[PDB]
């Protein structure tokens, strides 16, 4: 699933957290700010923590 999102994640679209993260909730949402091609943690601005954090593609979902 991480492959699928890595391909279709547009610079400025709406993302979703499908698993509980270090400062982010499962069910929390964000925006794609920028990613790394070879490095899987994409930085996305999460509304619950109010900041851009490192999350993995397989736990990154899009419902936007």
Swiss-Prot record:
Residues 1-64 form the CPH domain. Ubiquitously expressed in all tissues with highest expression in testis brain and kidney. Neddylated. Neddylation is mediated by E1 enzyme UBA3-NAE1 complex and E2 enzyme UBE2F. Structural rearrangment of the C-terminal TRIAD/RBR supradomain may play a role in neddylation and deneddylation. Component of the Cul9-RING complex consisting of CUL9 and RBX1; the CUL9-RBX1 complex is a heterododecamer composed of six CUL9 and six RBX1 protomers. Interacts (via C-terminal TRIAD/RBR supradomain) with E2 ubiquitin-conjugating enzyme UBE2L3. Interacts with CUL7; the interaction with the CUL7 component of the 3M complex leads to inhibition of CUL9 activity. The CUL7-CUL9 heterodimer seems to interact specifically with TP53, likely via the CPH domain. Forms a complex with p53/TP53 in the cytoplasm of unstressed cells. Interacts with UBCH7 and UBCH8. The C-terminal TRIAD/RBR supradomain is essential for ubiquitination activity. The IBR domain is required for interaction with UBCH7 and UBCH8. Belongs to the cullin family. This is Cullin-9. It comes from Homo sapiens (Human). The gene is CUL9. The chain holds residues 375 to 438 of 2517 of the full protein.
């Amino acid at each position: 699933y991480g492959e699928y999102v890595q391909q279709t994640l547009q610079p400025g679209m709406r993302v979703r957290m499908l698993d509980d993260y270090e400062e982010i909730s499962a069910g929390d949402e964000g925006e794609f700010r920028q990613s790394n091609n070879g490095i899987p943690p994409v930085q996305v601005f999460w509304q619950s923590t109010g900041r851009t954090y490192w999350v993995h593609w397989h736990m990154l979902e899009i419902l936007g």
